[PDB]
Paper text:
Here, we report the high-resolution structure of BrabA.11339.a, a structural genomics target that entered the pipeline as a ‘β-lactamase-like protein’. It therefore seems likely that BrabA.11339.a is a GTP/ATP or GDP/ADP hydrolase.
A high-resolution data set was collected at a synchroton at the Se edge wavelength, which also provided an independent source of phasing using a small anomalous signal from metal ions in the active site. The minor anomalous signal from these three anomalous scatterers was strong enough to phase the structure independently. In the native data set a partially occupied GMP could be identified. In the native structure, a partially occupied GMP molecule can be observed in the immediate proximity of the binuclear Mn2+ center. At no stage during the purification was GMP added to the protein; thus, it must have been copurified from the expression host. The two metals are 3.40 Å apart, bridged by water 330 and liganded by several histidine residues (His86, His88, His170 and His241) with bond distances between 2.22 and 2.24 Å, aspartate residues (Asp90 and Asp188) with bond distances between 2.28 and 2.31 Å and the phosphate group of GMP. The phosphate group is involved in hydrogen bonds to both manganese ions, the bridging water molecule 330 (called water 1 in the ligand-bound structures), histidine residues His88 and His241, aspartate residue Asp90 and further water molecules (315, 454 and 511 in the high-resolution structure). The structure of BrabA.11339.a and its binuclear manganese center were determined with high accuracy using high-resolution data and anomalous diffraction.
Author numbering:
A (entry chain A), B (entry chain A): 3 to 272
């Protein structure tokens, strides 16, 4: 059992369609390597105390959320934190309702105004019962914004998040620093004011979509350039699409850089 | 390879939270029997011609849609048909976009007015590009209504659906007859005018949630009463929650009635 630590689980490391795509397309990925089967991008963040009590926070609830949590072996949840309101990050939100029953209280969710206002449009019934329904709401909303730290309380003690702005094509997404672990998915450029949060990480988890340029995400080469500038002790690539085969990318990257895989798990001091 | 037939695949046979729930709760289900692991409710309907060309239609696109299609081994899709606009039936809709690329045309979707109007609210970006986006739409909407047959064309020939009304607690859901296979999920009562569609089926796929009453779904005992009245040659139970263990329900039900399981597949003449 984990003790006196933060524990991170890469619940999903794929691009928006997953790997393979729904049509069975593996791209250039070796279909025989289980690490190439990729769920939609999400991170589990836990804090364990000396007795093994935990605070549990998920970053994003995409379509794979239920299976991600089942496979993680972690059976409770304190909060959900959102990066941005794209389908692959939000469409599993209904599956929070089991925890609301278990906890006896609304699920605390954290989102910027852009994200919150999109969640209210898509999923209003999770916040307020509509005309003609008897389903109670399930979520309690909290604002977050770049450069404003926030803390989530729970049984293992507080987990302090440091949000910051990312450019994501035509919209903004959030990245987060949690201690000296940084999570940067769905990012095509880093604004200058965000750099303080991303430099000198023990572990930088950074999106690298594919080899070729894309308007909304770093290419592998762009992510590697950022890794060189930001000097993380270790980097883990995420949000990886079907052109990026695990073994191939492992060989192509520096020793301290690896492609992620679903279920990748590590502990750090806190 | 299938030939000269309709082929049905029970893509999912669980209740809205799945089995187990996201918190690892199996209820009374034996966790060691793989048939108790249940995805959200969905049916694949195919028609094969003499040469093995197929028309492929899915009923509902819930959160498990991507994995359901991958595991089915069927790598193309002609249309999606919807029963009603609950989370467990619609929140996988974004994953249709791969097929739009493969087919070179918008995905044809079929829904009643209630369902369509909810899809436009939750998922408007799938129909019309919003302000501030460059993502093209992916869906082409078609109306369906009880007691009005409709046909979907494709490579294997047309598949004719006969929709009908079901009471589902405080809303209406659709059931469908396809030849002499009937699909009745998310139903708490059958209106009189729907009975002609549901009687004398070769296979009746009918929702049975749990043993105890529920406002929105038949209990096992209620579904069995309907099966006795409607005299299907075979019945398959679906939308089954955590109280309903596969082996137990198999023993408790008549010979011609079985609990479903994910991946249950059969062929019938057409
Ligand atoms: N919820 C939502 N998802 C969107 C919108 N526009 C595009 N998407 C979906 O968001 C995902 C974008 O993928 P990305 O490449 O940023 O990982 C795709 O699944 C795409 O179809 C939108 O306006 N709202
Ligand atoms: N999309 C949507 N889902 C709903 C609404 N109200 C409840 N739900 C969800 O729909 C499902 C209802 O489950 P059922 O028992 O009918 O299978 C649950 O996942 C529930 O949280 C709503 O207004 N819209
Ligand atoms: K490497
Ligand atoms: K039986
Ligand atoms: Mn994404
Ligand atoms: Mn995105
Ligand atoms: Mn349902
Ligand atoms: Mn329903
Ligand atoms: Na805990
Ligand atoms: Na770019
Ligand atoms: Na076909
Ligand atoms: Na009832």
């Amino acid at each position: 059992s984990p003790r006196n630590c933060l524990r991170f689980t890469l619940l999903g490391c794929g691009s928006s369609p997953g790997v393979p795509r729904i049509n069975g397309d593996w791209g250039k990925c070796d279909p025989k390597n289980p690490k190439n089967r990729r769920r939609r991008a999400s991170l589990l963040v836990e804090r364990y105390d000396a007795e093994g009590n935990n605070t549990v926070v998920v970053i994003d609830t995409g379509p794979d959320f239920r299976m991600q949590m089942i496979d993680s072996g972690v059976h409770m949840l304190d909060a959900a934190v959102y990066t941005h309101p794209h389908a692959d990050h939000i469409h599993g939100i209904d599956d929070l309702r089991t925890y609301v029953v278990d906890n006896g209280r609304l699920m605390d969710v954290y989102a910027n105004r852009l994200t919150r206002n999109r969640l209210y449009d898509t999923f209003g019934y999770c916040f307020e019962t509509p005309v003609g329904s008897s389903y109670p709401p399930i979520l309690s909303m909290h604002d977050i914004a770049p450069e404003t730290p926030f803390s989530i309380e729970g049984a293992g003690g507080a987990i302090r998040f440091e949000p910051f702005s990312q450019v994501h094509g035509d919209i903004e997404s959030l990245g987060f620093r949690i201690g000296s672990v940084v999570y940067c998915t769905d990012v095509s450029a880093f604004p200058e004011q965000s750099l303080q949060y991303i430099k000198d990480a023990d572990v930088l988890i950074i999106g690298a979509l594919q080899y070729r340029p894309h308007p909304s995400h770093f290419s592998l080469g762009e992510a590697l350039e950022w890794i060189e500038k930001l000097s993380p002790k270790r980097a883990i690539l995420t949000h990886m699409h079907v052109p990026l085969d695990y073994e191939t990318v492992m060989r192509e990257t520096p020793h301290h850089v690896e492609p992620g895989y679903d279920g990748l798990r590590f502990e750090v001091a806190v």
